[PDB]
Every structure is written in structure tokens, then in C-alpha cells.
Amino acid sequence: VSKTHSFMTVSLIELWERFGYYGMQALIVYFMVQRLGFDDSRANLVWSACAALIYVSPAIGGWVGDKILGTKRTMLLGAGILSVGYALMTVPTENTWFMFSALGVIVVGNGLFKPNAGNLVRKIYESKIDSAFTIYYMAVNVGSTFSMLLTPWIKDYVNAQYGNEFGWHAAFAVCCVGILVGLGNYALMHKSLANYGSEPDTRPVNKKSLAIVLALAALSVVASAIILEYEDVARVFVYAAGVAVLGIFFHLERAGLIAALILTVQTVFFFIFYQQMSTSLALFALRNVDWDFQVFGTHLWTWSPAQFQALNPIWIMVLSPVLAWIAAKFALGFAVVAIGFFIYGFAGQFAVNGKTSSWVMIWGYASYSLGELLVSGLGLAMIARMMGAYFVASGISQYLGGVVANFASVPQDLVDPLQTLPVYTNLFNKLGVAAVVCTIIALAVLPLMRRLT
Amino acid sequence: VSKTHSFMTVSLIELWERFGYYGMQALIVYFMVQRLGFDDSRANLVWSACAALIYVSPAIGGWVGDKILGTKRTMLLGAGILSVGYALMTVPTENTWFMFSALGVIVVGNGLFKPNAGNLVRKIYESKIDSAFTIYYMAVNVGSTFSMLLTPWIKDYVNAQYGNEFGWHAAFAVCCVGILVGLGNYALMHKSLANYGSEPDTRPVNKKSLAIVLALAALSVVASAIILEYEDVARVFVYAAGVAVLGIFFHLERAGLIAALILTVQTVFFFIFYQQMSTSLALFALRNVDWDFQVFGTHLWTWSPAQFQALNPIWIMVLSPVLAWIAAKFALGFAVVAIGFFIYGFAGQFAVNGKTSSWVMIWGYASYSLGELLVSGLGLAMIARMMGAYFVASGISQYLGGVVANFASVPQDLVDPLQTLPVYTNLFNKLGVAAVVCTIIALAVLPLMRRLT
Numbered sequence: 001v002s003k004t005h006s007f008m009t010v011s012l013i014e015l016w017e018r019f020g021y022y023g024m025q026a027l028i029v030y031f032m033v034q035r036l037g038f039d040d041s042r043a044n045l046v047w048s049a050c051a052a053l054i055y056v057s058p059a060i061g062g063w064v065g066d067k068i069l070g071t072k073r074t075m076l077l078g079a080g081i082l083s084v085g086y087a088l089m090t091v092p093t094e095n096t097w098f099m100f101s102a103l104g105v106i107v108v109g110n111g112l113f114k115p116n117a118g119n120l121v122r123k124i125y126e127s128k129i130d131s132a133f134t135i136y137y138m139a140v141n142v143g144s145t146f147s148m149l150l151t152p153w154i155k156d157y158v159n160a161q162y163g164n165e166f167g168w169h170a171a172f173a174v175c176c177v178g179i180l181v182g183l184g185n186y187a188l189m190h191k192s193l194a195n196y197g198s199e200p201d202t203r204p205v206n207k208k209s210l211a212i213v214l215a216l217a218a219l220s221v222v223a224s225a226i227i228l229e230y231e232d233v234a235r236v237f238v239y240a241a242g243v244a245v246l247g248i249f250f251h252l253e254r255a256g257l258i259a260a261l262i263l264t265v266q267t268v269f270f271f272i273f274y275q276q277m278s279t280s281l282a283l284f285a286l287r288n289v290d291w292d293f294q295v296f297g298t299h300l301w302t303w304s305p306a307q308f309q310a311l312n313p314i315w316i317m318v319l320s321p322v323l324a325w326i327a328a329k330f331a332l333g334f335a336v337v338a339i340g341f342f343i344y345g346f347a348g349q350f351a352v353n354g355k356t357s358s359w360v361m362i363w364g365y366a367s368y369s370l371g372e373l374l375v376s377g378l379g380l381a382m383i384a385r386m387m388g389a390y391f392v393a394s395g396i397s398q399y400l401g402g403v404v405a406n407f408a409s410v411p412q413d414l415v416d417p418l419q420t421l422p423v424y425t426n427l428f429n430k431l432g433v434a435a436v437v438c439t440i441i442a443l444a445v446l447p448l449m450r451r452l453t
Numbered sequence: 454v455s456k457t458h459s460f461m462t463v464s465l466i467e468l469w470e471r472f473g474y475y476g477m478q479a480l481i482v483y484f485m486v487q488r489l490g491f492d493d494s495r496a497n498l499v500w501s502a503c504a505a506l507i508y509v510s511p512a513i514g515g516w517v518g519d520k521i522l523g524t525k526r527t528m529l530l531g532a533g534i535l536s537v538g539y540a541l542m543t544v545p546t547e548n549t550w551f552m553f554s555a556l557g558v559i560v561v562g563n564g565l566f567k568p569n570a571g572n573l574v575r576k577i578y579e580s581k582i583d584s585a586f587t588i589y590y591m592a593v594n595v596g597s598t599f600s601m602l603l604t605p606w607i608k609d610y611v612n613a614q615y616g617n618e619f620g621w622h623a624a625f626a627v628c629c630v631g632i633l634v635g636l637g638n639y640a641l642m643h644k645s646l647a648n649y650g651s652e653p654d655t656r657p658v659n660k661k662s663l664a665i666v667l668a669l670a671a672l673s674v675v676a677s678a679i680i681l682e683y684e685d686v687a688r689v690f691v692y693a694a695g696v697a698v699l700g701i702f703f704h705l706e707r708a709g710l711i712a713a714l715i716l717t718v719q720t721v722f723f724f725i726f727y728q729q730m731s732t733s734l735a736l737f738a739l740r741n742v743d744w745d746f747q748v749f750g751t752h753l754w755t756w757s758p759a760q761f762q763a764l765n766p767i768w769i770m771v772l773s774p775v776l777a778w779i780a781a782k783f784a785l786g787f788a789v790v791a792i793g794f795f796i797y798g799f800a801g802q803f804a805v806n807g808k809t810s811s812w813v814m815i816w817g818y819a820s821y822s823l824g825e826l827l828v829s830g831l832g833l834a835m836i837a838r839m840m841g842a843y844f845v846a847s848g849i850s851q852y853l854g855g856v857v858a859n860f861a862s863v864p865q866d867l868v869d870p871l872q873t874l875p876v877y878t879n880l881f882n883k884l885g886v887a888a889v890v891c892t893i894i895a896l897a898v899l900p901l902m903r904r905l906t
């Protein structure tokens with residue numbers, strides 16, 4: 001029919017999918033701590049392990065979509081599988097193996113969904129795909145803004161009208177019906193727009209490969225769940241992945257991909273900072289920020305700590321037209337990040353009563369997410385001048401980011417915000433210095449970049 | 454004889470002039486504070502006012518040499534005049550007006566000396582005026598290394614075998630015989646190499662203009678001494694020079710020199726940091742650094758605080774071959790300066806007994822002088838794509854650097870190093886952050902400099 005309409009339909013189902021995902025993510029760490037009983041260094045570790053799993057998932061899921069089931073049918077199967085993930089997260093049980101399974105299913109289902117939705121935009125436009133992708137990208141941010149703005153307060157609201165359960169589970173149900181929404185959306189527009197796109201979708205579904213792909217999926221859910229439950233297992237598996245990427249690198253001309261080596265170590269650093277906002281900045285928000293947001297000197301409104309993360313896509317959309325108006329922008333990325341961290345770093349020496357900051361979150365997220373904005377060029381074709389080595393590197397860096405968040409973990413018997421503030425600002429300051437170390441590294445590695453050219 | 458020997462003589466007489474000068478500088482703030490009774494916020498202001506004067510002096514002096522007296526005879530005359538400056542500084546009196554005159558004389562005499570020695574370096578080579586000038590720069594650094602290592606130690610030694618005066622005046626006498634040394638050098642070589650160079654030096658010396666410039670020079674010493682002694686005077690004329698450069702800029706195609714504007718405001722900041730090392734870091738060294746230097750883990754040796762500043766040219770020599778082996782190099786400069794300030798910033802939370810660091814000076818100074826090195830592109834030809842506006846902004850920034858240095862001034866009645874440590878590391882840490890803002894400014898202003906091209 002057109003390329004814009006199927007770019008539309010794929011961007012819509014994308015949008016609702018991410019709605020579900022990020023709504024879920026903000027609440028997931030606060031859940032592991034506040035409703036489940038987890039201390040915060042387990043909370044970080046489990047979340048980061050599940051994060052790395054999630055980030056490194058679309059490798060296999062993509063290969064399954066491209067060459068085994070259809071790209072569309074795989075994308076759909078992902079959609080169903082995560083409708084079921086959130087569905088699980090919705091049953092009111094305080095048993096971790098249940099939640100851990102639910103997270104396992106989201107890992108599997110996500111690996112099946114997103115490389116294939118992205119792949120379909122990519123097939124819809126043959127070039128203009130980058131514009132397409134940026135448009136695509138913005139769909140993401142909008143969905144996730146609303147999701148994150150929404151889900152915590154559903155939990156808040158419900159935890160207020162009823163006792164502790166659901167509340168959280170209500171929110172996870174919101175996620176679920178977000179996925180479901182995106183699915184009805186997809187059907188109608190299924191044939192409406194999607195029509196031509198995929199490769200092994202041109203022939204009828206090989207039910208043995210469907211079977212075996214399902215079986216292996218459930219297995220992956222169990223494997224995931226045993227990675228999440230047992231910290232030491234996950235840590236070993238991450239470490240193995242580490243010695244693996246070091247293998248691939250140390251046996252893989254020298255100037256261009258010692259430049260590539262440097263590039264992905266700098267990728268890893270960047271992701272550690274990025275991981276900081278699910279985890280350490282989240283707990284600092286929960287523990288040390290006046291949730292009363294005043295526009296000096298009005299009142300409204302009053303944050304729910306989780307909602308702070310919505311400032312991320314918000315600022316992205318906000319700064320997206322401004323930037324509309326050369327690996328030196330890594331340097332800039334890192335520098336601006338450094339300054340975000342220093343903003344939280346001096347969340348202490350100004351506007352403090354123990355629990356006080358508020359605007360520290362806003363400007364922090366501006367600086368940080370701006371940094372993210374100036375590095376949307378970390379595709380691997382950009383260390384070309386291999387999906388595996390870098391994707392695993394990057395997953396490994398999600399987990400690592402969780403352990404750094406653990407460099408600022410607070411005891412559960414320590415509830416005096418007056419004493420927890422220092423711990424968080426100490427982390428944040430040494431990250432800000434780290435981000436400047438990293439800016440130095442970037443700018444210093446730019447001579448190798450025009451010795452290759 | 455050859456152009457290499459006349460580059461040789463001008464570099465030799467240069468080296469010794471700079472010898473006298475920097476021996477004097479290190480010792481000058483410690484003098485105003487320890488032997489004179491000045492508190493450090495006066496010591497900072499007075500030394501910084503003298504600094505700005507010194508830096509903008511070579512304007513008049515360069516033109517006097519080019520267009521009124523000879524370039525050779527003006528350089529020489531500058532030399533005599535600073536023989537007399539340091540000579541003055543050596544007479545043992547605690548008289549403020551006395552010293553201030555001595556400094557006035559150093560200003561006059563410098564303005565006559567350095568622009569002309571440098572000018573004739575530039576006539577000796579007719580593109581390897583660049584090779585010549587970097588060699589020249591190295592001659593400078595080595596000389597100032599000798600003096601900075603020597604004179605403080607003289608001051609200590611003589612202050613030990615005799616009572617309070619000389620010690621210091623002894624050190625300044627050392628400077629004076631440094632100038633005198635360089636002068637004998639020049640005599641011999643007077644005719645030997647220097648021979649041809651200058652414009653109004655080809656005809657016999659016009660004694661009306663000799664008499665009138667000497668007279669105006671005496672005046673320059675009185676105007677100087679009164680700008681230094683009375684702090685408020687200096688601050689008024691500094692302010693005046695301020696409204697002047699702000700004028701000239703904002704009534705003085707727009708994109709390239711709004712970029713030039715940005716470039717010189719970052720030069721201005723840069724000079725503030727660099728001034729931090731005569732001042733706040735010097736006092737910090739004198740007050741909160743274990744002067745016993747240990748190379749893990751024997752004893753040798755034991756510093757004199759002033760001698761710490763010798764680390765500046767030392768590292769320059771040490772790292773200048775390293776760099777032997779793109780105004781983003783301004784960005785990098787700022788970033789590296791930044792971690793220098795963070796090294797001193799966490800000179801406390803590391804290695805502390807009250808008065809403790811030692812290596813902090815070394816690594817900090819390593820970092821600073823690396824930054825200085827990587828920004829040798831602050832020629833005014835680098836904001837072409839104006840001697841005055843840039844020079845005056847730059848002097849004004851010497852003084853400003855003095856007032857920031859003052860953001861860490863300590864009461865004279867406060868001698869508990871345990872309390873003086875925080876004041877200094879707080880200055881230093883937030884300078885480091887400011888320096889990351891400047892890294893961000895520079896990288897951010899690089900699109901303007903590729904729109905000029």
C-alpha cells in the first residue's frame with residue numbers, strides 16, 4: 001500500500017511494546033527492594049544480570065526471525081511471549097522464582113520481538129531508513145515517557161486504595177495490556193500495512209522449527225531464571241562472556257582495530273554510566289530527593305521516585321529538535337555525562353535537609369541523556385573502520401554497571417537519609433571524574449581515527 | 454657568523470633572563486606571605502596584579518624596540534633595567550613601597566626585554582621560525598627549571614645560617630647575577646652573533662628618544678608601584694581594561710569571530726587555572742603537603758614548597774618529546790587540567806596526616822603542564838579565522854586568576870592544617886568541574902570553526 005503506513009504500523013507496535021517494557025523496568029528495581037525484601041546490592045545485581053540477558057538476547061532472536069520462522073512471525077511470537085511475561089508479573093505472589101521466571105520470559109520474548117521489528121523498518125525502506133529509524137526512535141521515547149509517567153502511580157494509586165497487593169502487580173498488568181494493545185494494533189494493521197517484509201515468512205510455518213524454537217524458548221526461560229536467582233552463577237556467566245570477548249579481540253590492520261578495541265572499551269564505560277540510572281540513581285532518588293517538585297516558589301506536583309526515569313526520554317524528545325540545528329562527540333558525550341554526575345555530586349552541598357534535591361534529578365537527567373543523544377553513533381559498522389563480540393561486551397557492561405551501582409549500596413538497617421546522601425554523592429562524584437577520564441581517552445584516541453583514513 | 458649562532462645567543466641571553474625571573478616569581482608569593490606580613494588574599498591580589506601588568510607590558514616594549522630605539526638596544530636596555538629590578542629586591546628592608554618599586558621596575562624592564570628578544574629570534578629565521586621558537590621555548594623552560602630549583606633552596610639555606618634577612622634577598626641577588634650573567638653572555642656574543650636584526654638600530658641612538666623613553670619608564674615604575682600597593686587602584690584599572698575589551702569586542706562575518714569571542718573567553722578561563730599555580734596551589738603546597746618526597750618506599754629528598762613549581766617546566770621538558778610522537782586540543786587541554794585539579798581535590802581523601810600529599814604535587818603538576826603543552830596554539834592568528842583585545846583580556850585574566858586563588862584564602866590566625874586542607878581541596882575540586890565545563894564549551898564551539906572553513 002505504502003512504505004509510510006507500514007513504517008507506521010511497525011512504529012506503533014514498537015511504541016506499545018516499549019511502553020510495556022520501560023513501565024515495567026522502573027518499577028522492577030523499586031519492586032525487588034520495596035515489595036520483595038531484597039537488599040539493594042542483590043537488587044542491582046539481579047536487575048543488571050537480567051539487563052545483560054535482555055540486551056544480549058536479540059542476537060539469537062534476530063537469527064531465528066531472519067532465517068527460521070518469519071521476521072514478522074518471530075516478531076509476533078515475541079509479542080505474545082512478553083504479553084505472557086507481564087501477565088506473570090501480574091500474579092500476586094511474593095515468591096522470587098515466580099518473578100524470576102517472569103523476567104526469564106521477558107528476556108526470551110524480547111530477543112524474539114525487537115531485532116525483528118527493527119528489521120522490518122529496515123526492510124520497509126530498502127538511505128531514508130535513518131530518518132525512518134530516528135522517527136522510529138522517537139516513537140519509542142514517547143511510548144516509554146507515558147509508560148514511565150504512568151506505571152508507578154498506578155502502583156501508588158492502587159497501593160493506596162488496596163493493601164500492598166496488587167499495587168505493583170496492577171502496574172505490571174498495565175504493561176501487559178500495553179503489549180496486548182500493541183497486538184490488536186498489529187492485527188488490524190497486520191495485513192493492512194506489513195504485507196511485504198521478512199524472508200522465511202514467504203513459505204508456511206515449519207511446525208517442527210516452530211516446535212523446537214518454542215521448546216528451546218522455555219528452556220531459555222529456565223536458564224535465565226537460574227541466572228537471575230543465583231548471583232554467583234550469573235557472575236560466572238558474565239565473567240565467561242568476558243574472557244570470551246577478550247578471546248575474540250586478543251586473536252583478532254593494527255591501527256584501525258586497536259582503535260576499535262579502544263572504541264568498545266569506551267562503549268563499556270558509557271553503558272556503566274547508563275546502567276547507573278536504573279539502579280544507583282534510582283535508589284538515591286527513592287532515598288534522598290524531595291519528591292515535592294516546586295517551580296520556585298509554586299507547589300505541584302509531587303514525584304513518585306520511579307517517575308524520574310521518564311525525564312530521560314522526555315529530555316530526549318526535548319533536546320531532539322535542538323540538536324537537529326566527529327567521534328569527538330564521544331568526548332562531548334562523556335564530558336556532559338561527567339557534569340550530570342557532578343550535579344548529583346553537589347546535590348548535597350546545596351538544597352539539603354537530608355532528603356532534598358528534586359531539581360537535581362531534572363538537570364542531572366538533562367545532562368546525562370543529552371550525552372546519550374550525542375552518542376547515537378555506536379553501531380558496529382562504526383568500529384569497522386562482529387555483532388557478537390561487541391553485543392556481549394555491551395551486555396557485560398550492563399551487569400558491570402550494576403556492580404558500580406553496588407559501589408553505592410545502602411544497608412537495610414540504615415534509613416537515615418542524612419547518612420545515605422554521602423554514600424550516593426561519593427559514587428556520583430567518582431563517576432563524574434571517571435566520565436572526564438573517559439573524555440580524555442576519547443579525544444586522545446582521535447589521531448588513530450584519522451591515521452586509518 | 455651563522456643564523457644558528459645568533460639564535461643561540463638570543464636563546465642564551467633569553468634562558469638567563471628567564472632564570473632570574475622565575476626564581477623570583479616562586480619566591481615572590483612566599484615572600485609577601487612569610488617575610489613580609491601580608492595575608493594571602495593580598496598576596497594573591499598583589500602578585501596577580503603584577504602578573505597582568507607583566508603580561509601586557511611587552512606591548513609597549515615591543516613597539517618601542519621596533520619603531521623608536523633599536524630592537525637589540527631595547528632588549529639590552531630591558532636587561533639592564535631588570536638587573537636593577539632584582540638588584541633592588543636584594544636590599545634588605547621590610548619596606549612595602551620599596552619592594553613594590555622593585556616589581557614596577559621588573560614590569561618596565563620586562564616589557565622592554567621579552568618582546569624584542571623574541572622579535573629578533575623571529576628575524577634570525579627570515580617556517581623553521583617555528584622549529585627555532587620551540588627550541589627557544591625549551592631554553593626558557595630549562596632556565597626557569599634551574600632557578601626554581603636553586604633560589605628557594607638558597608633562601609632556605611641562607612635563612613638558616615643567618616637571621617631572616619637576607620635568605621630571601623639572597624635569593625633575589627641570585628636572580629640579579631642571573632641577569633648579569635646573561636648580560637656578559639650577550640656582550641661577548643654581542644657582536645659575535647646577534648649582529649643583523651632590528652629596524653631603528655641601524656642609525657646612531659637618538660638620545661632625545663632615549664631620554665624620553667627612560668623618563669616614561671620611571672613614570673611606568675611609579676604608576677606600577679601605585680597600582681600594586683593599593684589593591685583598590687589595581688581593581689579599578691583592571692575593571693576599566695575590562696569594560697574596554699568588552700567594548701572593543703561588542704562593536705567589532707559574525708560567525709567566525711563570535712567563534713573568536715568564544716575562543717578568547719576560554720583563553721581567559723585557561724589563564725585563571727594557570728594562575729592558580731603561583732597562588733592557591735603554592736600556598737596549598739606551603740601549608741598542606743608533606744615536603745618529604747618519597748619514591749615508594751625509602752626517603753629522598755625533602756622539598757622546599759616553592760621548588761614544587763619547578764615541576765612545571767620539568768614535566769614540560771619530560772613530556773615534550775612524548776607529544777612529538779584540531780582546536781579540539783583546547784578541549785583536551787581543559788579536560789586534562791580538570792583531572793589535575795581533581796588530583797589535588799582528592800589529595801585529602803588520599804594520603805593524609807593533616808599536612809599530607811607530596812606526590813600530589815607531582816602528578817597534579819604533570820597533568821597541568823601537559824594541558825599547557827597541548828595548548829600552545831593560542832596565538833592571535835588562531836582567532837584570526839587584535840594584539841590588543843586578546844592581550845588585555847589575557848592580562849585581566851591573570852588578575853581574575855588571582856581572585857579565584859583568593860576563593861581559597863586562609864586567615865593568618867588559622868594554622869591547623871587539618872582545617873586548611875578542606876578550603877584548598879574545595880577550591881581545587883570545583884575548579885576541576887569548571888574545567889570540564891570549558892571542555893564542553895570547546896567541543897561545542899567546534900562546529901562554528903568548521904563553518905568558517
Ligand SMILES: CCCCCCCCCCCCO[C@@H]1O[C@H](CO)[C@@H](O[C@H]2O[C@H](CO)[C@@H](O)[C@H](O)[C@H]2O)[C@H](O)[C@H]1O
Pocket residue numbers: 145146149150152153156301302303304
Ligand atoms: C494520554 C496521553 C499521555 C499524556 C502524558 C502522560 C500522562 C501521565 C500519566 C501519569 C502522571 C501521574 O503521576 C503522578 O504521580 C504522583 C504521585 O504518585 C501524583 O501525586 C499525587 O498524589 C499525592 C498523594 O496523595 C498528592 O499529594 C499529590 O498532590 C498528587 O499530585 C501526581 O498526581 C501525578 O503527576
Ligand SMILES: CCCCCCCCCCCCO[C@@H]1O[C@H](CO)[C@@H](O[C@H]2O[C@H](CO)[C@@H](O)[C@H](O)[C@H]2O)[C@H](O)[C@H]1O
Pocket residue numbers: 081095096097098101102105214217218221
Ligand atoms: C515459552 C514460554 C515460557 C513460559 C514459562 C512460565 C512458567 C513459570 C513457572 C513459575 C513457577 C515457579 O515455581 C517455583 O519453583 C521453585 C523451585 O525451584 C519453588 O522453590 C521454593 O522451594 C524451595 C524449597 O527448598 C525454597 O527454599 C525456595 O525459596 C522456594 O522459592 C517455588 O516455590 C515455586 O513457586
Ligand SMILES: CCCCCCCCCCCCO[C@@H]1O[C@H](CO)[C@@H](O[C@H]2O[C@H](CO)[C@@H](O)[C@H](O)[C@H]2O)[C@H](O)[C@H]1O
Pocket residue numbers: 598599602603605606609610754755756757760
Ligand atoms: C642545569 C639543570 C638545572 C636543574 C637541576 C638544578 C640543581 C638544583 C639546584 C639546587 C638544589 C636544591 O634543592 C633541594 O632543596 C631541599 C630543601 O631546601 C634540600 O634539602 C636538604 O636540606 C634539608 C634540611 O637540612 C634536608 O632535610 C634534606 O635531606 C636535604 O637534602 C636539598 O638539598 C635539595 O635537594
Ligand SMILES: [Zn+2]
Pocket residue numbers: 345429798882
Ligand atoms: Zn568533585
